[model samples]
Structures are given as C-alpha cells and as structure tokens.
Target: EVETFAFQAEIAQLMSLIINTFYSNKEIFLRELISNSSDALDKIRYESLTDPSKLDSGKELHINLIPNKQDRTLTIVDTGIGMTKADLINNLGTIAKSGTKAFMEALQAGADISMIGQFGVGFYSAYLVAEKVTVITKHNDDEQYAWESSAGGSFTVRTDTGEPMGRGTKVILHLKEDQTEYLEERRIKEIVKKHSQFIGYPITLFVEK
Candidate 1:
C-alpha cells in the first residue's frame, strides 16, 4: 500500500525558494546527497550490530554515483535502509518538518545555511539542480516502490515491477543544461571526498566502460 501527505502553504513557499535559490554553488547538490547517503549508511551499520535481523538484510553500507553521459542523468545509489512510500511523502512533501521555515528563521537570526542542512530539508537540495528526480527503493519491511516528480508540488509513488535488487535505494537526477557539471566523474569524486571523506563506509562511482 502507498501513503502520502498534502503540501502546506509554508511548504509551497519553501519549495519555490529552494528550487529558485539557496545554495551558493550548483556543485553542492552532489555533496549534500552524498553526505546524506553516508549518514544513512552509518545509521544502518550501527543498527546491524544490535539487531541481527538487520544483518540478514543482505546489503552493504556504501554509496554509488553513476554518471551517464548519453542520457545526461546522474544516479546516486546507496545500500542503506530504504524509505517507504509513506516516508517519501511525509518527508518530501512537507516543509515544516523538512526545516525550510526554520532555516529562514535561522537566516533572519543571522545563522548559517549549514546549520539548516544539519537538521532538515537538506535532502531537498537535490531539487535545486534536478529538472526531474526519481527515487527507487527496496525497504526490508516494505515492497519495492518508486517515487517521481519534477520539483512540482505533486509526486507519484507506485509499486515497482522491476527486480528488487537486495536492499537499499537509488536516486536518479535528470539535470538541466547548466547543471551538467554534476555528471562529471572527477567532480563527483572531489565533492564526495570533500563533504564525505570521513564517512564511515566506502563510496564508489560507477563509470561506464
């Protein structure tokens, strides 16, 4: 079964603010996503030591970034505990919990954007560059599902018919012309190291041969 939520007025405003402006650099998008992937891995890896069932899930905690030259799309994959349909909705649709409004409040108080990222809506930074975004996930406790949107207020989540490859998630970003730098392997590697080098698990980039 699928679950979701409606976007509040504040969330709509925040989406406009984000898809329009926020980060100083477009390259930061990759950094934020990789950082998030790293965090997810860290979470699962920690839980595995305590929960034997988590160990049986059969997925490693790592990040994979794929640069597709022909399709002009960049894909980031992670073997972390994936989100459910409900998570995609509540987490992606709303801004209050996502930390957009709080970020604005912090900015008014002269706080840094980095402060906001550490709390909420940091994941939405992907929308800053992606013309379209798709998340494919297989949660150990739920069916495989896919969520897709174009940074609009609405998103659709449906059961996935494709093979559910073990456990974890993948995010595919369709970049705008100006954001093509995100598809560069050298650039991706650099950002991963800069923002997530200290990440507990290894991060790999899938390059087409």
Candidate 2:
C-alpha cells in the first residue's frame, strides 16, 4: 500500500543535528552507508546457510557505486539481503530508542548519536548531504518498494511501479549543490578504498553521465 507519514521526532532531530552541528564531517555519510550495505550483504550469506533459496541465484555479494554528474545524484546499490517495506519503517523510520523522550534525553547529554545503535543515526545521515533520498528495495519474499523523503517532516512509501531490481537495496541521493563532492570518482574511490577496503564484498564504481 502506498502511504505518507510524518517522520518520527527522532529522525527529524537527527537530521537537524547532522545539518547544523555535525555538518563538517558530512563525508562520514559514505562510511555509514557502506557499513549498512556490507552488513546486509553478509546477512544474506549467513541466511543461505540455513536455506538454499537465499543464494541470490549464485550471484556474489557486491556493492555498486554509481554517480550521475549531470543529475547530481549518487546511488549505492547492493546485491544483498534486501528488506520488506516494514523493514524500512523499523530501520529508517523509528530510528531512535523508543521515542523522543529517550532521544531528547540522550541529545541533552551530548551523546554520540551513533551509540544509539540498530542502524539508527547512520541511515538518517543521508540528509547531511542529500536534499532528497530515495530508497528502492526488494526482498526475496516481498514486492519492490520505494521510500522517499526530503526532510520536510514527512516521508512517503509506495510499491515500485517499475521493473524489479532483483533482490537488494538501492539508495539514491539527490545531491545538494555543495554536496556534489560525493559525485566524484576520485573522492568516492578514495573514501571506499580508505574506509571500506576491509569489507568482504567487492565494491564497484560504474561511471555514467
């Protein structure tokens, strides 16, 4: 079912925190996203141990880093354990501990937002460099879906109307002018080689207009 809903206060505050106080280190967004993709990549491999159907049709796990300079967009597509629409809400929507009560309390303490765990502030960091973020995902057992937001206090979700992308997650960032640094091959390769080199799966960078 297609839907729209106001983002949780935790997510909103996390965006503001990143945009305002945490802006200097915006490059960290790449690190966080790569971490998530690698984790999902490994999850599928682990699951295949119990069920052969999770094998991804003999496809190896990997991450594709695609940058469109003309469109000012960057996409990180992974051949991994994709998720259902419900997983998007749980991981990307309710991004804090319980509710704002705990979130604000932690914020007041100047806690490192990353400590909140369970893919919390990491995913929201996309707002640091992206004016809009679109996530296209499909699970082996669920239909493809898209989750999108522009930090306007609300986000939307809908069943994907296009062809299936097999089974994985694709995160596309519509870059803000200053954030186009992320759309460069040199910069992205530097970030991936320096930070994500230890990750198990291969990460490929496909250049396009």
Error of 2 at 138 (Å): 0.2
Candidate 2 Cα lDDT to native? 0.79
The residue ranges of model 1 lying beyond 4 angstroms of the native Cα positions read: 1-5, 22-24, 91-98, 110-116
Q: After superposition, how far is residue 34 of candidate 2 from its true place, in Å?
A: 0.5
Q: What total of clashing residue pairs does each candidate reach?
A: 1, 0
Q: Residue 162: error of model 1 in Å?
A: 2.2
Name every residue pair that clashes in candidate 2: none
Which digits, one per residue and each the tens of the lDDT, describe model 1 over residues 1-209? 44443456666566677677567666666767877777777777788878868857675677878899799899989998787776776745554454676777776787755554665667666777788888898877888898877755766688888877577888899888888887777887788777777776777888764
Off by over 4 Å in 2: 56-58, 90-92, 98-119
lDDT of 2 by residue, 129-187 (tens): 89999999988988899999888678888999986888889999999998888888889
lDDT of model 2 at position 40: 87
Error of 1 at 103 (Å): 0.8
